[PDB]
Amino acid sequence: GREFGNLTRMRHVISYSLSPFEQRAYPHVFTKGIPNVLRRIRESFFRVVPQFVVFYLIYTWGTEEFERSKRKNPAAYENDK
Amino acid sequence: VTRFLGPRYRELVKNWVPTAYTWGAVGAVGLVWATDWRLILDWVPYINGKF
Amino acid sequence: TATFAQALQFVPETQVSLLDNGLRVASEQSSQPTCTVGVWIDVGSRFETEKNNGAGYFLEHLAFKGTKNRPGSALEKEVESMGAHLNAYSTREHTAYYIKALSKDLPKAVELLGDIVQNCSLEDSQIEKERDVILREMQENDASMRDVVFNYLHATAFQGTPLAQAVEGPSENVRKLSRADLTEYLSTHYKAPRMVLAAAGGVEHQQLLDLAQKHLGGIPWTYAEDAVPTLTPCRFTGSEIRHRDDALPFAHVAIAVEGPGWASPDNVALQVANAIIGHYDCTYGGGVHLSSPLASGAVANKLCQSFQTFSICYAETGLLGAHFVCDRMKIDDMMFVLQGQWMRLCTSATESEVARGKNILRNALVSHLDGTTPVCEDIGRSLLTYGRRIPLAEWESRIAEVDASVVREICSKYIYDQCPAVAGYGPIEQLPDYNRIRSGMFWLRF
Amino acid sequence: AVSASGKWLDGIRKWYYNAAGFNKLGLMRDDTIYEDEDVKEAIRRLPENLYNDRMFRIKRALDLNLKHQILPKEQWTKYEEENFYLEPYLKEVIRERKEREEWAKK
Amino acid sequence: AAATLTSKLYSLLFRRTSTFALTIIVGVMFFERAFDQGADAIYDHINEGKLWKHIKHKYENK
Amino acid sequence: TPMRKTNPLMKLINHSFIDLPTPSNISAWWNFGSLLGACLILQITTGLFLAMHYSPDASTAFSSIAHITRDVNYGWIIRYLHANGASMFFICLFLHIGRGLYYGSFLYSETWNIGIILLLATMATAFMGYVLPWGQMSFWGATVITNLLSAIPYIGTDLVQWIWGGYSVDSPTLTRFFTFHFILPFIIAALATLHLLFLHETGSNNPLGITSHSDKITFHPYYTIKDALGLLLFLLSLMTLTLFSPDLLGDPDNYTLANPLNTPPHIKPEWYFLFAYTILRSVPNKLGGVLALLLSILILAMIPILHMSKQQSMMFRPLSQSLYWLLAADLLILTWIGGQPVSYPFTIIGQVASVLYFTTILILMPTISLIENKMLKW
Numbered sequence A: 001g002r003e004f005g006n007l008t009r010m011r012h013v014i015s016y017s018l019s020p021f022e023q024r025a026y027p028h029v030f031t032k033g034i035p036n037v038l039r040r041i042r043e044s045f046f047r048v049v050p051q052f053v054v055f056y057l058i059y060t061w062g063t064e065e066f067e068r069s070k071r072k073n074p075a076a077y078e079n080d081k
Numbered sequence B: 001v002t003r004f005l006g007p008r009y010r011e012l013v014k015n016w017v018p019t020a021y022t023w024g025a026v027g028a029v030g031l032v033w034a035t036d037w038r039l040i041l042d043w044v045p046y047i048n049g050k051f
Numbered sequence C: 001t002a003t004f005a006q007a008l009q010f011v012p013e014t015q016v017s018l019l020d021n022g023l024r025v026a027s028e029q030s031s032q033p034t035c036t037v038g039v040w041i042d043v044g045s046r047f048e049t050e051k052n053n054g055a056g057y058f059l060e061h062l063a064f065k066g067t068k069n070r071p072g073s074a075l076e077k078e079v080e081s082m083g084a085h086l087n088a089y090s091t092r093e094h095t096a097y098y099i100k101a102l103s104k105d106l107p108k109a110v111e112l113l114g115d116i117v118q119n120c121s122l123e124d125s126q127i128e129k130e131r132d133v134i135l136r137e138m139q140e141n142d143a144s145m146r147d148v149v150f151n152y153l154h155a156t157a158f159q160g161t162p163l164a165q166a167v168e169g170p171s172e173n174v175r176k177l178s179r180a181d182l183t184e185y186l187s188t189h190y191k192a193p194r195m196v197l198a199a200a201g202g203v204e205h206q207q208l209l210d211l212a213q214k215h216l217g218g219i220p221w222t223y224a225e226d227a228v229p230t231l232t233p234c235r236f237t238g239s240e241i242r243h244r245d246d247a248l249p250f251a252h253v254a255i256a257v258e259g260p261g262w263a264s265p266d267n268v269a270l271q272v273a274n275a276i277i278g279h280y281d282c283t284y285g286g287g288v289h290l291s292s293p294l295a296s297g298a299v300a301n302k303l304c305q306s307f308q309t310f311s312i313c314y315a316e317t318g319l320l321g322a323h324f325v326c327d328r329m330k331i332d333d334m335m336f337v338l339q340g341q342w343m344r345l346c347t348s349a350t351e352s353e354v355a356r357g358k359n360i361l362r363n364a365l366v367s368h369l370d371g372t373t374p375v376c377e378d379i380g381r382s383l384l385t386y387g388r389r390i391p392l393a394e395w396e397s398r399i400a401e402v403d404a405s406v407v408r409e410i411c412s413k414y415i416y417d418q419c420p421a422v423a424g425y426g427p428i429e430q431l432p433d434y435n436r437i438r439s440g441m442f443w444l445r446f
Numbered sequence D: 001a002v003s004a005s006g007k008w009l010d011g012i013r014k015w016y017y018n019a020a021g022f023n024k025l026g027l028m029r030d031d032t033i034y035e036d037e038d039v040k041e042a043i044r045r046l047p048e049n050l051y052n053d054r055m056f057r058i059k060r061a062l063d064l065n066l067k068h069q070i071l072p073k074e075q076w077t078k079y080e081e082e083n084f085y086l087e088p089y090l091k092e093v094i095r096e097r098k099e100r101e102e103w104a105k106k
Numbered sequence E: 001a002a003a004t005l006t007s008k009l010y011s012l013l014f015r016r017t018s019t020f021a022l023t024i025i026v027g028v029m030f031f032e033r034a035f036d037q038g039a040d041a042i043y044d045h046i047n048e049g050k051l052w053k054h055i056k057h058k059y060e061n062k
Numbered sequence F: 001t002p003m004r005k006t007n008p009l010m011k012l013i014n015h016s017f018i019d020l021p022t023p024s025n026i027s028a029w030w031n032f033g034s035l036l037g038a039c040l041i042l043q044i045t046t047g048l049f050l051a052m053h054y055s056p057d058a059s060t061a062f063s064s065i066a067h068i069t070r071d072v073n074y075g076w077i078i079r080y081l082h083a084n085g086a087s088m089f090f091i092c093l094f095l096h097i098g099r100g101l102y103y104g105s106f107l108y109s110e111t112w113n114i115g116i117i118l119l120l121a122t123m124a125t126a127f128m129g130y131v132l133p134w135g136q137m138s139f140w141g142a143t144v145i146t147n148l149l150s151a152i153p154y155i156g157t158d159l160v161q162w163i164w165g166g167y168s169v170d171s172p173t174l175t176r177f178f179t180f181h182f183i184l185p186f187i188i189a190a191l192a193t194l195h196l197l198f199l200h201e202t203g204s205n206n207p208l209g210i211t212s213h214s215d216k217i218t219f220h221p222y223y224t225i226k227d228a229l230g231l232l233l234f235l236l237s238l239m240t241l242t243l244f245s246p247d248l249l250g251d252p253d254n255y256t257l258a259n260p261l262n263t264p265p266h267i268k269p270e271w272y273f274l275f276a277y278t279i280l281r282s283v284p285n286k287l288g289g290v291l292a293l294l295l296s297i298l299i300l301a302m303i304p305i306l307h308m309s310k311q312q313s314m315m316f317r318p319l320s321q322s323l324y325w326l327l328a329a330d331l332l333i334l335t336w337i338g339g340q341p342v343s344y345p346f347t348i349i350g351q352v353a354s355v356l357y358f359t360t361i362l363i364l365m366p367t368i369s370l371i372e373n374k375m376l377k378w
């Protein structure tokens, strides 16, 4: 019972439109599109990236630490004797 | 969650206690029979076709 | 000031004199000019054979159209001259007549009863008139619901039992009744000690006693040929009647389980249970989710249009149950709620709901007894079965004794896993087949 | 119960208020609230013009979300601009539910 | 006016469905053993001298 | 009077596809759900043509696959589309679940739970299917995974041998796994039908989290071509994974025959299971590692109970968003740790990553949700 006639009541919200054939597929791309994608990415940055950077840090540190203990292990035999 | 505790809910749970132990007996004995559990079935007086 | 314990005691005790012929005089003193006087005969529709089913009702129509002592029109002229409002009825178990007049007029009424019961001329023209009158009355009351559906409920519940047939009697029968059959019915039924004179109100007792002896002292207490019509035990059945007729605006279902006889303790607790299931009507602003849980179900997605929970009772046997009007599309759903309520009292009965039910029941038993007519009918109907009058203080003493465990115990005793009797006057199709109902009488969880 | 630190609380609440993105879409605070049945009945009780303003602002938000755009900076909702219209009604509804429940546990 | 055994049996075991399922399960508990040993005894009885378990006597327990 | 409204099959298609309202502002993430619906078909169809040559005996399971990759015409493309196809299946799956966790889609609790059960089904399917090739990692993975069942305290080994069909992994176990692997995906399909069944009586959620009844739109005109583009990009990424770098998501050693005797070094399970495997590596106890493992996936069921915010989507609640991406980074941490041999650096990071994985969503999220509640003055 949720057909389009059954949905929410709403009152005088007039809406305008155009035929797809009456308008080009890529309006104002260079002037309005790219800056929009840019503000989007700029909103996304600090909320997303830095924690991944922390992943890069823990990754490189873990690799350097394993590789360090492994190859300094004979070096640990060296300081041993 | 806090709302569920109360003066009448104690009464209700108490009303359904015998049913709870009875179905618990149903599940227990039913499990013991479905599994042919050997441990308790060694103790039962007549059900000893198991060797 | 206001308090229960004293107020129960201020209500006067009812004196019960015994005439030598066995007629039971009774009275309840009060300080008001008005008083009602009546004779609640023990005779009812239960006693007639199929040969004479319509006798008591028909005589109920012409008990006072005429009489041997005075012309009937002169009689009604006299009662109208007194300002009195004589009235009568005839239940399946209890015939009754009564007057409604000033204490100043009290003696004049009493002897009138001593006419109406003892002797009434039965002119064949009058009876012949009452014939077509009743025949058209048969065309009258059919239009009404409720009473029709209860009549199917009795025909269902009892079938071969004498109790099963309606008070009005078959239409085929009523045109066939003869005056001789009526004199037979009169000679074989209306007499002491079945009779019980009663006059609650302003009536002083001793005057009622003297007036009782003088006129009502003449009633014979001996049956001819010792042909005593002993009452008989009544079997109950789990069957159903399902009249349809789809053109009606509403289905009008009535369901009932076997109940305790008129004189057993259990009924009291049952009354409390009926207070819990709760009667309701959609005309009220008290509906919605409010009021009775069955009413809360009646109005949420909007189910029952109007309904009532009833506990009809006779000697030995009775009928607990429920009754509801319904739309065609919802007839099943209202059932699912109803039985569930029963089941809820058959298992999980919380104390507070029982308390509310006890308060509603007390309020009912007290509110019923205001006025002179209700207490006269009370003294009569109570003397006809219980004996005594079973005083209100004893009622609250017996109601206070009720507890949720007692409620669940008795309701399990009579409701749980019992076979329902069903009477459904239509339109009907969504109403569950009887196996669905019978299986609806018990949970698999409990 | 803090004083000037409470003004500091007003400051951090303002900053967090600007951290939430609904100002970019013109929404009032109450539009954003999750609509469970209590909120449903709370919306049902709204005066017609207010309910209309709510439904339209919701459409404007969804429409802006369609084209992944943003309401112009002049038109953004301001922290002092908001009217907390839905609170009294929702509080009435919730209080009624708590009343029915407290009665129901007894 | 003597009571039927079912009048008490229903009043005890069958009145509640949980006890009903319980007595059913115990009934299965006994019926499995009894019926199995019975059918085994019968099938063992029809064909005496055929089954090898009865032929074990030529070589069993030393 | 359109015919769609008349014929019942056309009625159901008119519901599920052509006419059902959807929020207009639905983004690219919801598309992944439909993509999963697509992937299953591929995983059937492609897989259906691998079963026509595969022999589930232990003595010939490997040589039969050599028969497929070599002797059969165009068999290798089917092989690689199948193997990479499972990987794309779990990628779309993880993105799908992340989408459902982010936008507060878990409030549809029944749909959520059916999604969880369907998840466990797909996991078992991928496991038994990975066991089918009968290489080194396949055989060894089976032995290691199966033993976990042995963990259960009383029943244990009888149950484990009941899975093996013998003392040890062998041909009957391989045949059984071939059967269950054959049968499970269709059950996954019926569950998916249940899934969409529960889903549609309320309608799809929208990114804002506000109800979209004011702006509902028919599915056919728009989302069919949107999902056509998403399916096309899906086939693009899949074909690029198959025709250029077939191997990198896979693991060398499977091309060697299984040895009951010899034991392979790195012993790493295929990547989608890796994080869970790390948890086994994390808890020293056997049964404790098993329970932590089962909690690793069950835990999703507890999320709706743990919800505290008076809003759905994280997008209006940046702090919880930051916790969310911390959670994703943590999953990357476990997923990377699963590829590594036990050593000092790894064991410590694995334990900390696991404990953080449990604490961030059993403690921190509800609390910061309450903080976000108090910051907005209600």
Ligand SMILES: CCCCCCCCCCCCCCCCC[C@@H](O)O[C@H](CO[C@H](O)CCCCCCCCCCCCCCC)COP(=O)(O)OCC[N+](C)(C)C
Pocket (backbone or CB within 6 Å): B030, C417, C439, C442, C444, E014, E015, E016, E017, E018, E020, E021, E024, E025
């Ligand atoms: C390949 C095909 C497979 C199917 C094979 C079909 C075989 C044919 C037989 C199947 C149907 C036979 C009909 C059996 C009788 C009908 C059952 C029904 O009548 O029982 C009702 C109720 O159903 C059961 O009796 C309820 C008790 C359930 C007991 C469960 C025992 C344990 C079962 C555990 C199985 C769980 C699945 C585990 C699988 C691994 C009783 O109704 P009723 O008498 O009017 O009301 C109850 C009256 N009270 C008040 C006395 C209780």
Ligand code: HEM
Pocket (backbone or CB within 6 Å): F039, F040, F043, F044, F045, F047, F048, F049, F050, F051, F054, F065, F068, F079, F082, F083, F085, F086, F087, F089, F122, F125, F126, F129, F130, F132, F133, F181, F182, F185, F186, F188
């Ligand atoms: C969601 C559904 C499915 C998924 C995710 C899936 C995944 C997998 C995976 C990961 C493998 C391992 C192959 C490798 O790593 O080399 C595999 C192999 C296999 N799959 Fe599926 N599968 C699915 C459904 C099916 C279906 C429906 C069939 C029907 C025939 C099937 C048949 C096979 C066969 C026969 C193999 C082994 C043959 C070979 O690897 O050469 N699978 N599958």
Ligand code: HEM
Pocket (backbone or CB within 6 Å): F029, F030, F031, F032, F033, F034, F035, F036, F037, F038, F040, F093, F096, F097, F100, F105, F106, F108, F111, F112, F115, F116, F118, F119, F192, F195, F196, F199, F203, F204, F205, F206, F300
């Ligand atoms: C093969 C696996 C699956 C298939 C085919 C599938 C199918 C679908 C489809 C077609 C939709 C329609 C909306 C959309 O596509 O975004 C959907 C929505 C949804 N799915 Fe899945 N699903 C799968 C797995 C899962 C899993 C694993 C979960 C959760 C852990 C899940 C939870 C949900 C939820 C909560 C929605 C509601 C979307 C909304 O509210 O907007 N699904 N699913």
